[PDB]
Amino acid sequence: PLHRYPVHLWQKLRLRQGICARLPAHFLRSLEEERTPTPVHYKPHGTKFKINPKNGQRERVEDVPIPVHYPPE
Amino acid sequence: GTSLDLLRSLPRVSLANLKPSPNSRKRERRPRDRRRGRKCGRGHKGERQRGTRPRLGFEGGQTPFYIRIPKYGFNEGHSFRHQYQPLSLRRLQYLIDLGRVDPTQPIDLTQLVNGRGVTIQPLKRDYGVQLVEEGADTFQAKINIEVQLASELAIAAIEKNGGVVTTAFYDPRSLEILCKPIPFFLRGQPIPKRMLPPESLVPYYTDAKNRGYLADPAKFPEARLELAMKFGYVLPDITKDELFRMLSARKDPRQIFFGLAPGWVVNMADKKILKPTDENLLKYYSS
Amino acid sequence: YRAPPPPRRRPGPHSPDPENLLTPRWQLTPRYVAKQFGRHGAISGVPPASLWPTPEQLRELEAEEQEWYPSLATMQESLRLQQQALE
Amino acid sequence: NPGFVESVDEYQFVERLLPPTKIPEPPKHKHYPTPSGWQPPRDPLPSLPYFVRRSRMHNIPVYKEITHGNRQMTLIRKVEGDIWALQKDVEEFLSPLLGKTPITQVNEVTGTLRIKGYFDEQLKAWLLEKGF
Amino acid sequence: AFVRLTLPPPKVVDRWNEKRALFGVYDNIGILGNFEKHPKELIKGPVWLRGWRGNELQRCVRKKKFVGNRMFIEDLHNLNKRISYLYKHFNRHGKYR
Amino acid sequence: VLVCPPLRSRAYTPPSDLQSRLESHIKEVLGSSLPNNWQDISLDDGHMKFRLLAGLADGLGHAVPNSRLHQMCRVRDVLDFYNVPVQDKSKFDELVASNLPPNLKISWSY
Amino acid sequence: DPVLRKCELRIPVHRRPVQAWVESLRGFEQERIGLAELHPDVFATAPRLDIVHQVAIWQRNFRRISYANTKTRAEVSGGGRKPWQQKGSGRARHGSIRSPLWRGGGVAHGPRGPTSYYYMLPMKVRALGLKVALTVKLMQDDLHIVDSLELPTADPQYLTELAQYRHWGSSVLLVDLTHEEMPKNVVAATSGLNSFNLIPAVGLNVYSMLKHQTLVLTLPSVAFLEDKLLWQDSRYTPLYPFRLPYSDFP
């Protein structure tokens, strides 16, 4: 068999049922939304395009955040 | 057809009478009998017989042939080179003769594609069609044709018969729309502007001798006459020609279609075209 | 027997439910909305003004154009200088 | 006041863009052969036992073929009627050129005649005279 | 070897039941229907192989790509191991290099 | 309330006076007597072929099969078609009524 | 008066038309009410029984998905530990109790998961097969052209009796132009008949024509069938899928 929903949607489903549903709408917005924090440990790309020096062609670039471990302390 | 008379005599065709065409199926051999069983075609026991021989190109430990040859830039930058589908005058005459291309109206890449005269693959780096001199001797048509590249001999044949040829540049996004306009219309976007040539191609498309679409019109008469003297024909005054209005037609450097301006929306479902009224958008598209 | 009615494609503009989690993401983009108008025109219900870029989007397009697509005069001038440097 | 104005006048240019799904019938020409070389089938029809039909592109269905990288062949394909009568004529027509009888295969199921060697141009001209 | 001492019950097959009688209908939906639907759209089966064919490594990767995120832990672990075994078989083992 | 007529055999034997029947039908179909060279009259006219062929089938009781209509180009082909007999007996059925030798015995279980 | 039908498309000049008897189902004896032309390129194609073999096999084998599966040694329960030591046992060497050689072990080369047999015959090939099948039914006297499927009564017995009277086969396939407009009387009669099956024109296929002994086509369906099949020859290759707008294609 298969699960009806993908695993990554499981958290959203729980927030939509039970005592979680009765929480205020504004509070759930904070839980639902996922926003990336400001870069700290890596330099962000200033532009969305740069020239690849070897072939001299315009190439799309993306920012991949470094995984950071936050201790409970 | 006597063969159909044979069917009359024979029993009914049915699912029980079906047979494949002779020799359409080979036999699959399983290693069960003595002939193909036993060692099963793998030979005596060894690395190859156990199925673990080295990879393709491995030569037993000496430096392989494909590695000992020096690296040289044969294919450097290959994916960024522009490719032009060659259209010969022989093929162009063949299409015109059989009615697949209409000489009364101007000919652009869309008409060539619609008539299946040329096959364009933008995803495979095609930038359009180049006129090819082959068939010039037997070309006897008066045509208005727009191509991306052209040769001196090919241009001579077009002009000698009384036609007009111009070289125009289309960018990869523009080329896909030009080749397949209808799929673009179904997307519901407005028609985009046509980008000007890269700096490398600016000299080519601004030169009268190449009939560039960005070239100075004032310099065309001299260039057209020069070919006439060089190739031994008399330049025909096309202004007197009845079809001068069609022959003289040329698209604007920023226009993809003849009668459609950038920024319009083609509503095929309701047979309407929608034009923007916002001033800022009009400045964007008019530019 | 009589065969069941022939299979047919669903006709008309189709707007997926935004809240439903299962509904695929690609069907909820503005790109999908424009496609409905292109196929079915007016009955789609799309406000046509939305099809064109919005003023904030228009600025992004113009900003992008200047950086990577120069004008003809600038292209000609740079080519002229290179020839002089070569000469 | 909406930002869009609708016009039907310019839809003619949109219609011009629609591509056809049907190969157009060739236009009537004042003088044949046409500069490319194409000429339509003659009327009245030939009275031979065999008829060679034209392709969907309105050309004579003769094709050069090669297999194994060395076996050159020429194929006459859309033959209706007595395909054996065509074989007889082909052998006589090609025998003087060879100096010997050509080797041929008749596929009565598919309606094609296959000849060893490249004779496409001679057979294309030959079949035009017969009026197919 | 030992053999049955009795004849099994005879097999009764209705060749004109609705499913057998109407098999194949609408297989020409496209050419006879203006091409609005392709015949593959009539195929019923697993989501990852409707109108598609491939070898076992391809099928395993396709199932993971389609429904991998909705699979049970036992199944997904078994599917992933099957991919690695087939990957090593097709890319390193065999007679022909 | 609709009763199917009794099933009629598919066995046809050419009538002895075939010429008389055919020319009478042709005279009626043309309506202007019998013109010399009648046998070579072309049947390309759609209306005439239906009247001639349909009329013959009703009276004679044997109808041109769908496979053979295109072959009935001229009246001769129609004349030729009706003179060839059709037998409903199988090849085996003939053997039973074929004066078998005394030592040959055939039994029909169907 | 006669119901004389002519082909709406142009027949090639070197080929003469093929013809059939138009019939009616209103009465038992209404076996000839008209004379209908048939395009020779549809109903008089070459008798190509191998192409009929290709299409019918495609129709059977492209839908097929087999759900047969077996577990490999990796998927059977247990089997992790080595049963006994390599040396000093007097036994055959083993590393798992679930190998193929063991009872209860995995299957070495068994069916693997759901498997599909999907492939597509070229569109021209599948269209050519239908033309061959239609010709076969006509030349073998299994095809009956009808003006309409209207019937006097809804009793299924009447339809069966009529088939016997006209020497039709044990099974009959009936084709109508469209599903929506098919007459009520025939719908009721065919509903309860196993061997008389009613399909619309878009539902016609080679396999059903082989399964049923005789084919009944209405006159409008014949024109429908000719138009679609003859379009396949004399057409271009597709620039894009034909569902998209074209200059001259519906």
Ligand SMILES: [Mg+2]
């Ligand atoms: Mg094998």
Ligand SMILES: [Mg+2]
């Ligand atoms: Mg190409």
Ligand SMILES: [Mg+2]
């Ligand atoms: Mg294990």
Ligand SMILES: [Mg+2]
């Ligand atoms: Mg272990």
Ligand SMILES: [Mg+2]
């Ligand atoms: Mg081990």
Ligand SMILES: [Mg+2]
């Ligand atoms: Mg087991």
